[PDB]
Amino acid sequence: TFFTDASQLPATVYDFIVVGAGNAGNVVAARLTEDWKTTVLLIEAGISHEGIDSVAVPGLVLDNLPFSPVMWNYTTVPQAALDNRPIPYAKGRVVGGSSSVNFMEYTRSSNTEYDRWANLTGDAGWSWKNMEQYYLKNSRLVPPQDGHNTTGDVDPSVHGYGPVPLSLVGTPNPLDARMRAATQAPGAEFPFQLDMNGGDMIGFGIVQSTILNGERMHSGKAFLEPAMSRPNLHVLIENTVTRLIQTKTTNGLPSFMKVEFARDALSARSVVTATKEVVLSAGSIGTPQILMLSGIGDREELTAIGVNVTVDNPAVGKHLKDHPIMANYFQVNSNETYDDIFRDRDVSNTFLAQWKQNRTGPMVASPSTGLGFFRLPDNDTIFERFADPSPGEGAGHIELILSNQWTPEVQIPPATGSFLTVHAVVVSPASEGTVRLNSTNPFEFPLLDPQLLSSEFDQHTIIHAARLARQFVSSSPWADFVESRTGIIGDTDDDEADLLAAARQATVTIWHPMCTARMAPKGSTDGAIDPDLLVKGVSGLRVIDGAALPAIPATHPMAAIYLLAERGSDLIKQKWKL
Ligand SMILES: Cc1cc2nc3c(=O)[nH]c(=O)nc-3n(C[C@H](O)[C@H](O)[C@H](O)COP(=O)(O)OP(=O)(O)OC[C@H]3O[C@@H](n4cnc5c(N)ncnc54)[C@H](O)[C@@H]3O)c2cc1C
Ligand SMILES: COc1ccc(C(=O)O)cc1
C-alpha cells in the first residue's frame, strides 16, 4: 500500500524527491534507497497497480487501450502528413508507468546506440564500453514458462544478473517455426538473429519479454515493490506534480527544490522539499510539461502563454521523436491465432481462468512473436539527401513485428477469420516535433505534435517496410499459411503513390515519445540537460526518463530507458558520495 494524500506523509523534507513512479523513476527510487539511509519521496500521478489483471496478465494488455483507468489518453494536433488526422496517444498512468501497460518487449539496442549517445554528448561514460555494466545489472534471462527448448533462439552468454527478467514465450504459436525456417535457410532474403540483445539487432529474432512465472514484471515489480520494505522510501500515489517552486541559489544558479502537487485540479496544493536533488522521471510528455510550468523552457514561447520564465532553456519540449507504425494484415490458413481471444470475452475469460489457476496458456504471451530489424542498402539513393538517422552498424532503419493475430491499430479485426500482422515501423525516423503548453493550468492537456511521417525519409522507409513485409511472407515456409492481404495497406496495390496514400491513413504512433529534455554537451542549447542529466541553468534538478535520451532508440525503448536510469542512479550516488 501507498500514501494517497500529503497529510499521511511522515515528513515534508527528504534527501531526494523523484517525480513519476514509471519505467525510470522506480529504478531511481529503488537504487537511491539501497543504503537504507537516503530518504526518497516518490510522487506518482496515477493509481496503484495492485490487483489489476490487465496489468499483471500479459495476454490482457490490449484491454487497457484505448481508454482505461491505468492509461493517460490524449490525441495529437492534426498531423499534416497523415491527412490531418489527430492520432491517439497513450502512456501509463499507474505505478510502473508505461512499463505496466506496454507490450513487454525488451531490446537494449545495438552497441552503436550507446556509442551514438557518447558522440552526441561528448561523454564516453555513455559509450557501450561503459554502459555494458548497466545492462548486465538491469536484467537477466529466465526460462520460458512451459520449459520448451530455446536452443538457437537466445544466447545466455549475452545476458546479465539483474532484476528485470526476460523470457522467451511460455505458450506456442504458429509463427516462430515459420520465422526460423524462412530466415535460417541458406540464402534467406531476411537473415536470422540468434540474440538481438547481444549487440547486433539485424535479422529476425524471437522476442524477449519482461515476463516471469507468466506474469508481467514491470518496473513496479522489479524495482519498487522490493524497495518498499525500506524505512527510507516513501511513495505517494494519486498526486500530480503541478510545478517546481524556486528555492535559494546554489553555486550561482537558481534551484527548484520545492515540489508542488495535488490530487486533482480542485484539490488544495501541497509542497515538499528536497535537500539534495529533485529528479524528474515523469516521462517524455510529463517532464517537459513540469519544466515549462516551472518557468524552465523557451523564454519567448512560455512568456506568450503567460508563464513567468526563470531559466531560458529553449530545448525543453523540442526535438520530440516517436516511431510511426502501420499494420500489414494477412488472412491466414490457420486456426492457431489469438483472434478469438481478442474478439470473444468468454474465450478471453476462460484463458484468464487457466492463467489464474496455474499461470499457463495463451495469457502468458506478449502481443508479438518475433522482431526483425533491417537497414536500407548503404548504396541506397535516399542517402544522397539524408544522413543516416540510425546509430549505424547493428541497428535497423526498419522493424517488422510479427503478431499472431490482427493487432488493432487504426482498424480492429473482422468478426470472422484468422490473421497475422506484420507491423512496419520506422525505428530510425528523421521527423521531429514538439510538446507545448496550451495553458498555465497544470491539469490542462499538453499540445502534442510529433510531426509523424513529415520527413520524406520516414515516408519512403515505411513504404519500403510494407514491401519488405509482403516479401518476407512470400517464401515457401509461409506459402501454406498466408492466404491473402487485407486491411488498409494490404488491400493497396504495390504502386508507391497508392501505398503512400494508404500509409497516410493507416499510420499511427507506437507511443515511444522521446528526447523532449534531452542531453547535450555543456554550452550547447541543442538539449535541455547536460551529459550528467542535470538541467542546464539550474542547480539540484536532474531528468531521468525518456525525455533525457539524445536520440530515439532504433528499437523498443524501455530497455534503453532502464539503462539510462541505472547509470543516472550511479551518477547521483557518486556526486553525493552515498
Ligand atoms: C501501450 C504501450 C506499449 C509499449 N510497448 C513497448 C514495448 O513493448 N517495449 C518497449 O521497449 N517500449 C514500449 N513502450 C514504450 C515504453 O513503455 C516507454 O517509452 C517507457 O516505458 C517510458 O519510460 P519513462 O520512465 O520515460 O516514462 P513512464 O514509464 O511513462 O513513467 C512516467 C511516470 O510519471 C507519471 N507522471 C507523469 N506526469 C506526472 C506528474 N505531473 N506528476 C506525477 N507523476 C507524473 C506517469 O503517470 C508515469 O507513472 C510502450 C508504450 C506504451 C504506452
Ligand atoms: C504488436 O507488437 C508490438 C510490440 C511492441 C510495440 C512497442 O514497442 O510499442 C508495439 C507493437
Q: Is the CB of 17 under 6 A from ligand 1?
A: no
How many Å apart are CA 50 and CA 234, to the nearest integer? 17
Nearest ligand, CA of residue 139?
Answer: 1
Q: Using the mean position of ligand 1's atoms as its centre, give its distance from the Cα of residue 91 in Å.
A: 5
Q: Phi and psi (nearest 5°) for 337?
A: -85, 175
Which experiment gave this structure?
X-ray
Q: Using the mean position of ligand 2's atoms as its centre, give its distance from the Cα of residue 520 in Å.
A: 29
Which CB contacts under 8 angstroms, 24+ apart, belong to 374-377? 374/190, 374/202, 374/398, 374/399, 374/400, 374/465, 374/468, 375/202, 376/461, 376/464
Q: Is the CB of 166 under 6 A from ligand 1?
A: no
Say what angle helices 128-138 and 111-121 make with each other, to 10 degrees: 130
DSSP-derived letter for residue 152 is: T
∠ at Cα 428 (504, 531), nearest 5°?
Answer: 130
Q: Is the CB of 290 under 6 A from ligand 1?
A: yes
Which residue in this structure is represented by grid cell 509482403? 470
Contact 210, 99 (CB under 8 A): yes
Interior/surface letters 480-492, b for 16+ CB within 10 angstroms, e for the rest: ebbeebbbbbbeb
How many Å apart are CA 413 and CA 359, to the nearest integer? 27
Q: Sign of the C-alpha dihedral, residues 456, 458, 459, 464?
A: positive
How many Å apart are CA 188 and CA 246, to the nearest integer? 60
Please report the DSSP string for 216-228 in residue order: E--HIIIIIHHHT
- From the CA of 558, give the closest atom in ligand 2: 8
Ligand 2 pocket mutation pick from 323, 402, 423 by most atoms within 8 angstroms of CB:
423
SS3 state of residue 516: coil
Q: Is the CB of 44 under 6 A from ligand 1?
A: yes
Q: Is the CB of 554 under 6 A from ligand 1?
A: no
Please report the DSSP string for 528-563 in residue order: SB-TTSBBTT-BSEEE-SGGG-SS--SS-SHHHHHH
Ligand 1 pocket mutation pick from 60, 98, 263, 427 by most atoms within 8 angstroms of CB:
98
Q: Is the CB of 370 under 6 A from ligand 1?
A: no
Amino acid at 382: I
Nearest ligand, CA of residue 209?
Answer: 1
Q: Using the mean position of ligand 1's atoms as its centre, give its distance from the Cα of residue 217 in Å.
A: 14
Amino acid at 484: S
In this structure, the chain runs to a length of 578
Q: 216 - beta bridge partners?
A: 211
Resolution in A for the shown PDB structure?
1.8
Q: 127 - beta bridge partners?
A: none
Q: Using the mean position of ligand 2's atoms as its centre, give its distance from the Cα of residue 538 in Å.
A: 36
Residue 81's nearest CA partner among 421, 413, 322 is 322
Residue 158's nearest CA partner among 192, 126, 199 is 199
Domain spans in the chain, listed from the N-terminal domain onward = 6-51+220-320+514-576
Catalytic residues: 512, 556
How many Å apart are CA 320 and CA 281, to the nearest integer? 16
∠ at Cα 410 (407, 411), nearest 5°?
Answer: 65
Please report the DSSP string for 72-100 in residue order: EEEEPSPBGGGTTB--EEEEE-BTTGGGG
How many Å apart are CA 407 and CA 426, to the nearest integer? 18
Which residues does ligand 2 sit against, CB inside 6 Å? 103, 105, 367-368, 401, 403, 407, 423, 510-511, 556
Interior/surface letters 307-324, b for 16+ CB within 10 angstroms, e for the rest: bebbbbbbbbbbbbbbbb
Q: Which helix (H) or strand (E) holds 498?
A: helix 496-506
Residue 564's nearest CA partner among 542, 538, 546 is 546
SS3 state of residue 167: strand
Residue 139's alpha-carbon distances to 6, 151, 167, in angstroms, are 34, 20, 11
DSSP-derived letter for residue 268 is: P
Ligand 2, atom 5, lies closest to the CA of 103
Nearest ligand, CA of residue 282?
Answer: 1
Chain breaks in the chain (C to N over 2.5 A) after: none
Other Cβ atoms closer than 10 A to 550: 23
- From the CA of 559, give the closest atom in ligand 1: 11
Nearest ligand, CA of residue 28?
Answer: 1
Question: What does the block give as the cell for 103?
Answer: 507490450
Beta pairing, strands 311-312 & 296-297: parallel
DSSP-derived letter for residue 496 is: H
∠ at Cα 556 (555, 561), nearest 5°?
Answer: 105
Contact 440, 305 (CB under 8 A): yes
Contact 17, 278 (CB under 8 A): yes
Q: In terms of CATH architecture, what is 6-51+220-320+514-576?
A: 3-Layer(bba) Sandwich (3.50)
Ligand 1 pocket mutation pick from 4, 44, 94, 102 by most atoms within 8 angstroms of CB:
102
Q: Sign of the C-alpha dihedral, residues 56, 62, 68, 72?
A: positive
Q: Is the CB of 43 under 6 A from ligand 1?
A: yes
Q: Using the mean position of ligand 2's atoms as its centre, give its distance from the Cα of residue 128 in Å.
A: 25
Please report the DSSP string for 249-260 in residue order: EETTEEEEEEEE
Q: Using the mean position of ligand 1's atoms as its centre, give its distance from the Cα of residue 164 in Å.
A: 16
Residue 97's nearest CA partner among 557, 448, 575 is 557
Q: 206 - beta bridge partners?
A: 370
Ligand 2 pocket mutation pick from 105, 322, 404 by most atoms within 8 angstroms of CB:
105
Please report the DSSP string for 30-53 in residue order: HHHGGGS-S-EEEE-SSB--TT-H
Which CB contacts under 8 angstroms, 24+ apart, belong to 494-498? 494/467, 494/470, 496/463
Query: Residue 434, CB half-sphere, CA atoms under 13 Å: how many?
Result: 13
Q: Is the CB of 176 under 6 A from ligand 1?
A: no
SS3 state of residue 495: coil
Q: Sign of the C-alpha dihedral, residues 400, 405, 410, 411?
A: positive
Residue 69's nearest CA partner among 47, 88, 41 is 47
Contact 10, 16 (CB under 8 A): no
Q: 215 - beta bridge partners?
A: 212
Question: What does the block give as the cell for 559?
Answer: 530497455
Please report the DSSP string for 269-330 in residue order: PEEEEEEEEEEE-SHHHHHHHHHHHTTEE-HHHHHHHT---SEE-TTTTEEEB--EEEEEEE
Q: List, in order, residues 6 or more apart from 240 with CB less than 8 Å away.
A: 45, 261, 262, 263, 264, 442, 443
Q: Using the mean position of ligand 1's atoms as its centre, give its distance from the Cα of residue 23 in Å.
A: 6
Chain-centroid distance, C-alpha 438: 24
- From the CA of 24, give the closest atom in ligand 1: 25
- The percent of the chain in helix, strand and coil, each rounded to the nearest 5, is 30, 25, 45
Q: Is the CB of 240 under 6 A from ligand 1?
A: yes
Nearest ligand, CA of residue 58?
Answer: 1
Q: Is the CB of 283 under 6 A from ligand 1?
A: yes
Contact 213, 145 (CB under 8 A): yes
